[PDB]
Amino acid sequence: HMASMKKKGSVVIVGRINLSGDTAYAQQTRGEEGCQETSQTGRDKNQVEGEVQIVSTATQTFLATSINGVLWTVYHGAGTRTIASPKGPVTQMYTNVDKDLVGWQAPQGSRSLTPCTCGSSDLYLVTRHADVIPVRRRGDSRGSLLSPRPISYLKGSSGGPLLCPAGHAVGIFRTAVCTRGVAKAVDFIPVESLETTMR
Ligand SMILES: [Zn+2]
DSSP states (O other), X not given: OGGGOOOOOOBEEEEEEEOSSSSOEEEXXXXXXXXXXXXXXXXXXXXXXXXXXXXXXXXXXXXXXXXXXXXXXXXXXXXXXXXXXXXXXXXXXXXXXXXXXXXXXXXXXXOOBOBOOSOOOEEEEEOTTOOEEEEEEXXXXXXXXXXXEEGGGGTTOTTOEEEOTTXXXXXXXXXXXXXXXXXXXXXXXXXXXXXXXXX
């Protein structure tokens, strides 16, 4: 009955993918206990750094990527949930189920990637395990893995970035394209589609 109805939890930043040096690596900033409490209160006092965040819900863990002052991720992971912040749960600034895209204002202390202007088709996918996978762009919204892998390796990487050779943001990883469970290609949200949503 109505008095007993719970509320959806907040997305919680539980770590980041460090790309600021010569070596990419994942860092955890909050354990599962703190994540649970933070998800319920929506209050996160942790300092955020970097461009690529690891985020969790009650059920899922995936990625969120800051581009031009917006932290972007996929609707099929975050739905309409708020994200926890130092002042409380923060409401989504963008919500587009048709693009499978959501976004919040980038957390204070985060760094944003710059949208790519190069038109290059040699791309690099950053995974939740700090893999940097070469990807050849094949369309506005798809690239092919130079070395196909089992889908397991890409699980939980939605919302991660596809990068230009110069480190610009080219797209947000949306979902893998598989055959017999083997990921041979990836579909992503082009950054141009993000810029249009941003006006
Ligand atoms: Zn570029």
